[PDB]
Design a protein around this ligand. Structure first.
Ligand SMILES: Nc1nc(=O)c2ncn([C@@H]3O[C@H](CO)[C@@H](O)[C@H]3OP(=O)(O)OC[C@H]3O[C@@H](n4cnc5c(N)ncnc54)[C@H](O)[C@@H]3OP(=O)(O)O)c2[nH]1
Ligand SMILES: Nc1nc(=O)c2ncn([C@@H]3O[C@H](CO)[C@@H](O)[C@H]3OP(=O)(O)OC[C@H]3O[C@@H](n4cnc5c(N)ncnc54)[C@H](O)[C@@H]3OP(=O)(O)O)c2[nH]1
Lengths: 234, 229
């Protein structure tokens, strides 16, 4: 396999980078698609950050520092972590999510990047390419997943029935499983008790370009409501 | 008294009472950091960390300038350059978030009453709710309101309050416990769901963690910036 800085890597039949070793120690780095749900009990022993199951810790970065990514041309591309991006997956009924530091690339640059391309800070691996989010014409967001950046948020929650993602419509407030006008949500919230017959647990993610809402519910009763920056990677 | 678009008074506890905003009768009730209250009359109003309010405290932008009413009636101009985490519990509802904050010294903090109206563009946008000591002569002043675009807010129903715990140096967090990573990892893979619901907030100077649990089983784990007030 090929060696670069402190890693060894290979390439998938799906044109995806496979991280084989880091610091001369055998490694496991498994990339998940945005919002993908998988079930595989073998994955729970490893670390998880949004979009990756990894045997190696992807360490905390700082916004506005410079990282390097391996390009399809064997070169290193230097990028500044100027934006943020929200990504998630579901692995063994655990919703793993967070807002990640992100770089910005044009159409030409994105296509030179493989899903899995190692990302370096200094000459040490700090992350891998996991996803691309289109932020308009000739512009993409490149999240750098890993341990929560100091100013950001990360987390997980057990979701028995997955994560149902819903487009967040204009003029709607959010309670539990519904988005409705505020005056209605205010009446509904003060109305709801934890008494839904045959109440199943739910997790809902509502999204607009700027903001994400996550609720955790038992039946129609809202247990948690979290508001956080966007955007979401489809 | 009047100032800009508000009318205000003073409490027996030296706390500012907002009486009307835009000539409409107002209700602004300031809660202490982490305070738990129960009063069914509060649930009809808006709630942002540290305040129950009949008026919306709108979204602000970090690094913009706000003005605060001083004890002497003058306006002090401050820049929203920092953040800090605050919360309360009202009617078994944990209301929390990271708020934009200014930095003040001892002399300035002492000129500020809890409840002091905060203005942006000659309009009320918030009230003084809390002070968090940074150092000897340094304080953080949260400006509560609708979540700033880059930060987080939320709520959750907590039947048994919020347990606040100091977060120890080398400990990872699962559910109700903080333990070394190797045990937390095994414990997490151990859990499966007379189990009571729980909410725990572990705090460090830089970072805060909230867990929501059913007995010993962790349902949710949130990591977010600190500090806590
Ligand atoms: N993944 C991750 N994202 C972050 O943003 C982050 N910020 C700090 N840290 C800490 O750095 C070390 C990372 O290894 C840990 O000390 C971790 O502290 P913690 O975040 O306090 O510990 C909870 C552990 O416990 C893990 N688990 C929790 N529940 C489960 C579960 N059901 N199944 C499998 N693992 C579970 C949980 O994912 C996790 O461990 P992992 O790193 O292995 O992911 C982070 N970790
Ligand atoms: N409080 C608050 N903090 C923020 O950071 C924020 N960012 C946007 N918004 C929206 O701005 C308008 C402000 O009113 C609302 O449209 C709100 O949309 P939403 O945040 O999507 O709606 C859920 C409603 O519903 C309220 N409820 C939810 N549960 C309860 C409950 N048990 N009892 C009483 N009220 C409950 C919940 O507090 C809430 O209403 P409040 O405005 O009063 O805060 C925010 N609101």
């Amino acid at each position: 396999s090929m060696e670069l800085y402190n890693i060894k890597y290979a390439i998938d039949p799906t044109n995806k980078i496979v991280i084989e070793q880091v610091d001369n120690v055998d490694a496991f780095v498994h990339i998940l698609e945005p919002g993908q749900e998988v079930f595989d009990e073998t994955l729970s022993q490893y670390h998880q950050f949004p979009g990756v199951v990894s045997s190696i810790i992807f360490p905390q970065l700082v916004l506005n520092t410079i990282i390097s990514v391996l390009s399809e041309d064997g070169s290193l591309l230097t990028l500044k972590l100027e934006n943020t991006c929200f990504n998630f997956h579901v692995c063994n009924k655990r919703f793993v999510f967070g807002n990640l530091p992100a770089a910005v690339v044009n159409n030409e640059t994105k296509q030179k990047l493989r899903i899995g391309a190692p990302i370096f800070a200094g000459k040490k691996l700090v992350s891998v390419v996991t996803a691309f989010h289109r932020v308009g014409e000739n512009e993409w967001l490149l999240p750098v997943t890993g341990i929560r950046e100091a100013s950001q948020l990360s987390g997980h929650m057990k979701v028995l029935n997955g994560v149902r993602v819903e487009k967040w419509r204009p003029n709607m407030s959010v309670y539990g499983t519904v988005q409705l006008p505020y005056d209605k949500i205010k009446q509904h919230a003060l109305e709801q008790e934890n008494k839904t017959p045959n109440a199943l647990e739910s997790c809902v993610l509502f999204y607009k370009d700027s903001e994400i809402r996550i609720t955790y519910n038992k039946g129609d009763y809202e247990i948690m409501h979290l508001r956080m920056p966007g955007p979401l990677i489809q």
